Amino acid sequence: ARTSVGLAIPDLTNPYFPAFASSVVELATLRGWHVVVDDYGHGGRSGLDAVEHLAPQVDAVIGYLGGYADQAQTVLGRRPLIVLDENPGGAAGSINFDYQHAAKVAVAQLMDSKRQHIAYLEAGSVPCTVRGKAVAGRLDELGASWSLIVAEETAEAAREAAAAFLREHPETDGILAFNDLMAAGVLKALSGSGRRVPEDCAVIGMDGIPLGELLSPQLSTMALDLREVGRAAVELLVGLLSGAVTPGSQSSRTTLKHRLVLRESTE
């Protein structure tokens, strides 16, 4: 019997997650391992439910658990859990992202284009997300005149919110979106409103999904090298299973950075 790894993701509809999955599955498969994916964005299921479903079939789990790191590691006992993008707590391992760095770099690009009227579009129902608070922190630190927009995390939801906001605030000449999915919605709002990109208003996303290269204009984004993210998660898993890495230690907590990828949506 070969090593089996559970992969838990909150949906397949946000294109980040299938790209994340594909990367992890690619590298795990080349180690000769099996991977089973549980998409839990359905029927009110949670990150904890995903882990409970997978544990009897797997020797380990990697996933976005939506807060349930502690309880999930407990369900797993001595099988390692590697959580992404959350407080690791009692999890055996962790992969996080330097949002402060990302916030800094992304704002810088808009500042370099002397953008006077900036909006940040947040995923939600004041900023609520980790990346949200970083961007807001950096914008307030610089003294930029900026506004917060909030929308559910879909393209359509982001378009509608942006479209409305542009009517109330037509001067807006720079927009940072929570992610590339929402960013695609923003672009459409600008398109529909008759504004050119980047001339009348620039747009920067976050994630670096392939979708960005197919949009018109192609989308500038704070990208994550998904080969690096997967590699980080699999090697960390190797260490934890070999015992090279002690569960819960410093050496089991990794942080990765976004790289700015400039495309057509900025000048």
Next chain:
Amino acid sequence: AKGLVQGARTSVGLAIPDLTNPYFPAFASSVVELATLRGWHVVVDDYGHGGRSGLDAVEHLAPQVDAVIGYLGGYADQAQTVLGRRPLIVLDENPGGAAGSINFDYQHAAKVAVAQLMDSKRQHIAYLEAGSVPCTVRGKAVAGRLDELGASWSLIVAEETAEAAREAAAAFLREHPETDGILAFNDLMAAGVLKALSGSGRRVPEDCAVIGMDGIPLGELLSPQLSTMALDLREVGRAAVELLVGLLSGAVTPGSQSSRTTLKHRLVLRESTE
């Protein structure tokens, strides 16, 4: 005791060949939605890695599932043999001995997509096939239909990616600047084509019309928005899950005519056509 989750649950395996063609995540999500709402556990095996085949995915899934729904890359027959009486429902291929099958009417889709272009009086139509003469099923169906109409059309072939399709379209548009209509194998490849047309200063639809296939949500985000022969993925999922219910209940006999369902694409007109 009484607080617990009750009923030992049915377990379904979903085999997909990759997660990189946006069609499959959309397909998978739909199936996981419906299955989950029946109280089923689902596991997805993306087998587009390590040289693995659809048969490998079924071998992996079998011991931990009661049934498989999947795109199997031609291993339908061998996979059902592995599964024994555990039902396999295959999509878009010759099901062989598979317990159930869902396929699509590519002739109807060909006729509707082509009608659209004829109605806009496009004079120089190209079809972009996924590949390395038309080799795919829908590919043959479209050729058949255009040959039948006496239209003067060209064939383009590329690997099934956006970039490969872009690369191939651009090369073709140079030797064939007259090109005013393009049918793409699917929406992913179409997105490459839009890029090539844009990069060649050709307006869409005005100078060239583009129609894809699949109806992935991406079409609504491209500029121009992509007209396509669309599948309702709700309906495709519903047909798969319902068929499985019939097979597991015994209401549907494995291999019977009633275990083979044919679905149809619907034309969705967006920006990319006149």
